[PDB]
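Case study.
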Amino acid sequence: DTKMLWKHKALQKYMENLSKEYQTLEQCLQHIPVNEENRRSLNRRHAELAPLAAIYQEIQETEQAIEELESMCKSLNKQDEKQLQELALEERQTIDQKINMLYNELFQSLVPKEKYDKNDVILEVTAGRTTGGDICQQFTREIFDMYQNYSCYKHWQFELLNYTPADYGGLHHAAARISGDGVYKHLKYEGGIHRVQRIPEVGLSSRMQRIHTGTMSVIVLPQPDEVDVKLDPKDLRIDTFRAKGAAAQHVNKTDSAVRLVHIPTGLVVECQQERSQIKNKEIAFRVLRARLYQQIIEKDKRQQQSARKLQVGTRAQSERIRTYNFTQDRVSDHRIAYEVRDIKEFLCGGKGLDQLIQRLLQSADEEAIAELLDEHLKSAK
Amino acid sequence: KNVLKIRRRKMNHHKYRKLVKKTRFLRRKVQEGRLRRKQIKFEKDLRRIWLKAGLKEAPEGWQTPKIYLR
RNA sequence: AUGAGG
RNA sequence: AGUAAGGUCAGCUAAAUAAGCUAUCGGGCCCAUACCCCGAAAAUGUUGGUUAUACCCUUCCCGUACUACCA
RNA sequence: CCCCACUAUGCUUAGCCCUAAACCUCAACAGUUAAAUCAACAAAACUGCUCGCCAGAACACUACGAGCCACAGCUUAAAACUCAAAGGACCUGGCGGUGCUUCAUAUCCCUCUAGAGGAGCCUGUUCUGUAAUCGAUAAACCCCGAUCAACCUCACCACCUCUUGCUCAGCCUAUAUACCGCCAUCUUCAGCAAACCCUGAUGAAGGCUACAAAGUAAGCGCAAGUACCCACGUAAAGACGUUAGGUCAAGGUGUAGCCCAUGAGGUGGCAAGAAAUGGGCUACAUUUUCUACCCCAGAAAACUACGAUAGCCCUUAUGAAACUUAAGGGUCGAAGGUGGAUUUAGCAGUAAACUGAGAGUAGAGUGCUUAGUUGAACAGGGCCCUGAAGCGCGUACACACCGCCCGUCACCCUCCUCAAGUAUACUUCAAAGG
RNA sequence: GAUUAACCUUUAGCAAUAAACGAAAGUUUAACUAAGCUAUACUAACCCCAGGGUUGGUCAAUUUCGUGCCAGCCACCGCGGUCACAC
RNA sequence: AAUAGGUUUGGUCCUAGCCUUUCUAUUAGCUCUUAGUAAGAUUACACAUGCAAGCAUCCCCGUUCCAGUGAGUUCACCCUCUAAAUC
Ligand code: MET
Ligand SMILES: [K+]
Ligand SMILES: [K+]
Ligand SMILES: [K+]
Ligand SMILES: [K+]
Ligand SMILES: [K+]
Ligand SMILES: [K+]
Ligand SMILES: [K+]
Ligand SMILES: [K+]
Ligand SMILES: [K+]
Ligand SMILES: [K+]
Ligand SMILES: [K+]
Ligand SMILES: [Mg+2]
Ligand SMILES: [Mg+2]
Ligand SMILES: [Mg+2]
Ligand SMILES: [Mg+2]
Ligand SMILES: [Mg+2]
Ligand SMILES: [Mg+2]
Ligand SMILES: [Mg+2]
Ligand SMILES: [Mg+2]
Ligand SMILES: [Mg+2]
Ligand SMILES: [Mg+2]
Ligand SMILES: [Mg+2]
Ligand SMILES: [Mg+2]
Ligand SMILES: [Mg+2]
Ligand SMILES: [Mg+2]
Ligand SMILES: [Mg+2]
Ligand SMILES: [Mg+2]
Ligand SMILES: [Mg+2]
Ligand SMILES: [Mg+2]
Ligand SMILES: [Mg+2]
Ligand SMILES: [Mg+2]
Ligand SMILES: [Mg+2]
Ligand SMILES: [Mg+2]
Ligand SMILES: [Mg+2]
Ligand SMILES: [Mg+2]
Ligand SMILES: [Mg+2]
Ligand SMILES: [Mg+2]
Ligand SMILES: [Mg+2]
Ligand SMILES: [Mg+2]
Ligand SMILES: [Mg+2]
Ligand SMILES: [Mg+2]
Ligand SMILES: [Mg+2]
Ligand SMILES: [Mg+2]
Ligand SMILES: [Mg+2]
Ligand SMILES: [Mg+2]
Ligand SMILES: [Mg+2]
Ligand SMILES: [Mg+2]
Ligand SMILES: [Mg+2]
Ligand SMILES: [Mg+2]
Ligand SMILES: [Mg+2]
Ligand SMILES: [Mg+2]
Ligand SMILES: [Mg+2]
Ligand SMILES: [Mg+2]
Ligand SMILES: [Mg+2]
Ligand SMILES: [Mg+2]
Ligand SMILES: [Mg+2]
Ligand SMILES: [Mg+2]
Ligand SMILES: [Mg+2]
Ligand SMILES: [Mg+2]
Ligand SMILES: [Mg+2]
Ligand SMILES: [Mg+2]
Ligand SMILES: [Mg+2]
Ligand SMILES: [Mg+2]
Ligand SMILES: [Mg+2]
Ligand SMILES: [Mg+2]
Ligand SMILES: [Mg+2]
Ligand SMILES: [Mg+2]
Ligand SMILES: [Mg+2]
Ligand SMILES: [Mg+2]
Ligand SMILES: [Mg+2]
Ligand SMILES: [Mg+2]
Ligand SMILES: [Mg+2]
Ligand SMILES: [Mg+2]
Ligand SMILES: [Mg+2]
Ligand SMILES: [Mg+2]
Ligand SMILES: [Mg+2]
Ligand SMILES: [Mg+2]
Ligand SMILES: [Mg+2]
Ligand SMILES: [Mg+2]
Ligand SMILES: [Mg+2]
Ligand SMILES: [Mg+2]
Ligand SMILES: [Mg+2]
Ligand SMILES: [Mg+2]
Ligand SMILES: [Mg+2]
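After joint prediction, the assembly is written out as follows.
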């Protein structure tokens, strides 16, 4: 439980450091004259540590009451213990319920947030090539239907993009778009390779009633935004120079060629095909707009690629996240060691599937807390 | 006996001929380069003979022929 | 014409 | 910057009774799939005007095409 | 691949090219038929002597070097990386768009009779839908578990309630891929096989000739008996095995899981149709429709005909409960005008048509089981098509043709080669001369 | 010191032997002799003191759990997919 | 390659490779009690410091030996002839 995690010395030592740091900031802001630039940094740090210190102080007060409650019981007399101990137990249970919430509240506060909370997801499912028959392709159809039904359960809009059926009533590859609130947060853990172990019943592989292992790949990606290019004239440097080529005396005195340099990007576009500078300028703008249109597309794609590279995270592209064992009627998630019964209900994408995702969120938050304490352990030493 | 051994050589030979046909001009230039170096190396070997024997130049009336030609 | 996987 | 010309079943063409083929759906054939067989469904870029409409004109839009020369 | 037209080429002269499954894959000469003849197969086994050649597979009839009238060539011929096999010859089985021969009797084709696929309705299933079962789900699922669901059944759903609980607990929770039980299927088959003997040089394996040549065989199945109306027919029977065939939901049980519940009780609710489909029923009528009759009749006979067992309304039966189940009446008179590709069944009291009864229920099916009546047509050819048997042939299949397997593109990895230029490093000079 | 998978003391004596020198008594010698360090090897011993590897077959030898084609093992053949003599 | 063994396949027979089993030497892991003896940088890469050749009536002699290394490499052995050296 969460109580054992708080009992670990690493968390207790780190929480004391924050409390000491929180008190140190308060003293500096009140007695020591601080520069305006440095005062704001302390205020922001003090504000960030304010919810952490307040919860920690409540936890300390909660723990002290437990010691006081136990100390009072030890001094009681057996002639009047029966009535008072019953009241003491009720108070202790009430405090223990409160201290668990404080542990939960403190644990949740340490957890940071995610950039892609609400961005739409373009989900893709592909039948992995791992064994003979259509088991891999037949299983892909079930998974694709599970996500489609799960969208309805969460009231999410499911827009079909690509759908290539197999030759035996299965799916080779399918792509779809899901829109809603918190789509990426719930569906980010679903990316990976799924394993299915079942005896075929319907399909080409049903000719041999022997257990077969199949795999398929699920790809979860966020949806980007539109690409609109607006060229501010302040960021554009316009240079006029004489053109090159055999054009008699007109070129020698008229600066027809136009060179456009985009200061933020450094791209240089030159046009001299037309005789008139104005005619060249519009075309040179058009080439610059098209070239910078690709740059913004490259800008958008590169930003998304580097959005999560900063965070230390695993490459969730090829890994056996879950195992679907129809033989024993148990869906096992190896990441969190969570097993779900009634696979038939599980594949319906309803209450059962949501519980597994909720367990993933609960376990992932617990892992995030542990990493921060280990990260703060090195800084404390 | 089955022709399994012959079939393997049949496919290897067939793919080799298509590969040769596909890049017969690339190999032509490589062969051209090697023939020029072959003649130069041959000329060096003859040149070493008279230099090591004390002759400053080749014997009068002598000229190394281009043996590698068409 | 094609099909077989633990 | 000018001018020409094209916009038609999902797709591609033919005709302006808006058809054929593929695709598509349903059935049969086959242990199954495909081929195959039977049957069904499916469209005039858009605007307005052309007795009234369509193949026309025209409004608008997408794409295509040629020209932009001499000192 | 088949057909037609035509060129290089096949011919001649001269000069090239120097390859082949250039293989009789079996070296030249001199011998032998004796011993141990001899892995197998093929074309019996060896001696003397000499020459050529070979040392795991693949890379490789390749790279580089070299030689060549060769220049997309030939000859000679590697290495790194990779694999634990590759290969030769067989055994048995399967399979063959494999040969010959003989056949199939509701059966393969031709043929024979009535149907299905079209319509309405009834009833299943797939999909979709719903808070709302499960199983069957090519032949061998689809009026299937059900000789049956308004409540109950019930295992499902929502809500509520109980905790040593009807049980010296329980679970219709998972696993039919642990099983018993009871079956499907080849089977509309005739084979399976203990214990011995023999053959192949004492190998996987094989075992027959009747004017007979190594087979003998308990047991099982077929057969024989028995049931029904005969000795006929129909039932029944139908081995070993095949499909990890069906059934943890008849029951029981192995393993694993649940025990404030994945268990138990009560209330209410679910069972629908966008669409598609299987089976069946009733029809599209004149060999019919209605009535009388149970076979000498009178009418009807196209928008008031034929045709709903559907809809609506009413009544009645059962029940505590009926818009829901059934029967009856009224009203209504729809689609349907003999059905596309395709497909099922039947060899005689059979098909077809018609009429009863029974199982099960309080009631409830156009379903299932069963008795009786009227009562046919074709049955002759053929091996063309499909399949079976006998004797052969082939086989790179053995998970056994639903087998196996080949190459390009795309994908990833390793190693190597080639390559303009450049850089770095190494080697050589005096072993000479004035 | 660097480098490499490779890692011995910044001791003692000319007493023995060998070498150099002298006629000789003798002298010099990191040669050598006698020690120091180290399971590399051999031999021997020890009241108390034993570790390392392996245990599917080849090939001597596994109980109970955990794990569930995952983590991992193997010289060759291979084992691991919720009854593992192979982790 | 032996007294051999495992492994090609549905299976047999033949051929064949790879591997196992035996004996040493280094290095690594883990582990380590004594005594005696034997042996001992990976590198022809760079080296702080000390020492390793003196003797002796002066001249001579010795320091060309011993010790070390394995870079290079058919100068090593037999025969003929014949310096130096010892007697
Ligand atoms: C422009 O080019 C005009 N001056 C002509 C020059 S050549 C005669
Ligand atoms: K055979
Ligand atoms: K019909
Ligand atoms: K029907
Ligand atoms: K009820
Ligand atoms: K059970
Ligand atoms: K196979
Ligand atoms: K001495
Ligand atoms: K050691
Ligand atoms: K061997
Ligand atoms: K002296
Ligand atoms: K050396
Ligand atoms: Mg099964
Ligand atoms: Mg043959
Ligand atoms: Mg090849
Ligand atoms: Mg294909
Ligand atoms: Mg179709
Ligand atoms: Mg000719
Ligand atoms: Mg010939
Ligand atoms: Mg030959
Ligand atoms: Mg000869
Ligand atoms: Mg002869
Ligand atoms: Mg023989
Ligand atoms: Mg050749
Ligand atoms: Mg060649
Ligand atoms: Mg070479
Ligand atoms: Mg060459
Ligand atoms: Mg030759
Ligand atoms: Mg056959
Ligand atoms: Mg046959
Ligand atoms: Mg029949
Ligand atoms: Mg019908
Ligand atoms: Mg079940
Ligand atoms: Mg059902
Ligand atoms: Mg099922
Ligand atoms: Mg029913
Ligand atoms: Mg009910
Ligand atoms: Mg229950
Ligand atoms: Mg039970
Ligand atoms: Mg079974
Ligand atoms: Mg089943
Ligand atoms: Mg014998
Ligand atoms: Mg036998
Ligand atoms: Mg018998
Ligand atoms: Mg009889
Ligand atoms: Mg029977
Ligand atoms: Mg019988
Ligand atoms: Mg079946
Ligand atoms: Mg049971
Ligand atoms: Mg049970
Ligand atoms: Mg049990
Ligand atoms: Mg319950
Ligand atoms: Mg209940
Ligand atoms: Mg039926
Ligand atoms: Mg009637
Ligand atoms: Mg009625
Ligand atoms: Mg009543
Ligand atoms: Mg009624
Ligand atoms: Mg009427
Ligand atoms: Mg017809
Ligand atoms: Mg009845
Ligand atoms: Mg009754
Ligand atoms: Mg019914
Ligand atoms: Mg095939
Ligand atoms: Mg590509
Ligand atoms: Mg090179
Ligand atoms: Mg050492
Ligand atoms: Mg002395
Ligand atoms: Mg010593
Ligand atoms: Mg081990
Ligand atoms: Mg292997
Ligand atoms: Mg275990
Ligand atoms: Mg072992
Ligand atoms: Mg172990
Ligand atoms: Mg052997
Ligand atoms: Mg082999
Ligand atoms: Mg074989
Ligand atoms: Mg094997
Ligand atoms: Mg076997
Ligand atoms: Mg060998
Ligand atoms: Mg000294
Ligand atoms: Mg020496
Ligand atoms: Mg030394
Ligand atoms: Mg060396
Ligand atoms: Mg002399």
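Observations recorded in class. The first strand of chain A starts at residue 121 and ends at 127. The CA atoms of residues 355 and 372 of chain A lie 26 Å apart. We will return to this complex in the next lecture.
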